[PDB]
Amino acid sequence: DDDDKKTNWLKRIYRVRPCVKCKVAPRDWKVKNKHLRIYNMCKTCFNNSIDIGDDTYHGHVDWLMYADS
Amino acid sequence: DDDDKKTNWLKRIYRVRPCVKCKVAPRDWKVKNKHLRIYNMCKTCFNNSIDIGDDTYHGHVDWLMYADS
Numbered sequence: 001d002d003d004d005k006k007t008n009w010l011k012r013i014y015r016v017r018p019c020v021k022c023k024v025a026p027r028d029w030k031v032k033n034k035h036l037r038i039y040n041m042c043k044t045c046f047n048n049s050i051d052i053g054d055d056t057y058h059g060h061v062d063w064l065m066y067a068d069s
Numbered sequence: 070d071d072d073d074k075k076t077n078w079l080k081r082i083y084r085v086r087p088c089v090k091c092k093v094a095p096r097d098w099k100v101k102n103k104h105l106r107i108y109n110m111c112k113t114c115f116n117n118s119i120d121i122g123d124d125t126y127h128g129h130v131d132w133l134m135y136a137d138s
């Protein structure tokens with residue numbers, strides 16, 4: 001089944017690239033209509049970044065959750 | 070830059086999973102509005118499949134080409 005290929009790709013993508021900042025915590029994410037949005041940082045790092053004023057790592061990649069558009 | 074993260078993910082995704090049928094040729098693909106469609110087979114295998122009547126491996130996964138939706 002094709003939808004599973006997307007799912008496993010996304011599971012893998014989320015598992016193998018940790019937070020860009022601390023490099024250990026997994027990343028924050030949220031679901032939005034039909035996309036999975038993976039943010040560049042974990043929450044701890046993201047809130048920290050606001051506190052220290054660095055917007056360098058801000059950002060996300062949106063992923064289509066299904067095999068067909 | 071966030072768009073590059075998507076691009077490199079897609080380049081990697083295309084490189085590391087070959088044709089599902091022959092397992093060696095890279096897969097057929099085509100671009101469609103803002104998505105990259107990766108088919109499950111190379112062309113050689115796909116045309117072959119039509120010839121032999123197996124629709125088992127027919128299919129594709131569509132990928133958003135950009136980081137933002």
Ligand SMILES: Nc1ncnc2c1ncn2[C@@H]1O[C@H](COP(=O)(O)OP(=O)(O)O)[C@@H](O)[C@H]1O
Pocket residue numbers: 028039040041042043046057058059060
């Ligand atoms: N954990 C995080 N790591 C990096 N960037 C983040 C994180 N959380 C939010 N952001 C950034 O905050 C901005 C607004 O995010 P979001 O609330 O997803 O957008 P919208 O306002 O369209 O709903 C975006 O630049 C997003 O990348």
Ligand SMILES: Nc1ncnc2c1ncn2[C@@H]1O[C@H](COP(=O)(O)OP(=O)(O)O)[C@@H](O)[C@H]1O
Pocket residue numbers: 097108109110111112115126127128129
């Ligand atoms: N190389 C291939 N490998 C596997 N399936 C394919 C291949 N080429 C086309 N198909 C299948 O043919 C069907 C029609 O494909 P396509 O022309 O992309 O759709 P559309 O008719 O919406 O433009 C889809 O099921 C697609 O997966």
Ligand SMILES: [Cl-]
Pocket residue numbers: 062063064065131132133
């Ligand atoms: Cl996607």
Ligand SMILES: [Zn+2]
Pocket residue numbers: 019020021022023024025041042043044045046
């Ligand atoms: Zn972190």
Ligand SMILES: [Zn+2]
Pocket residue numbers: 088089090091092093094110111112113114115
């Ligand atoms: Zn093949």
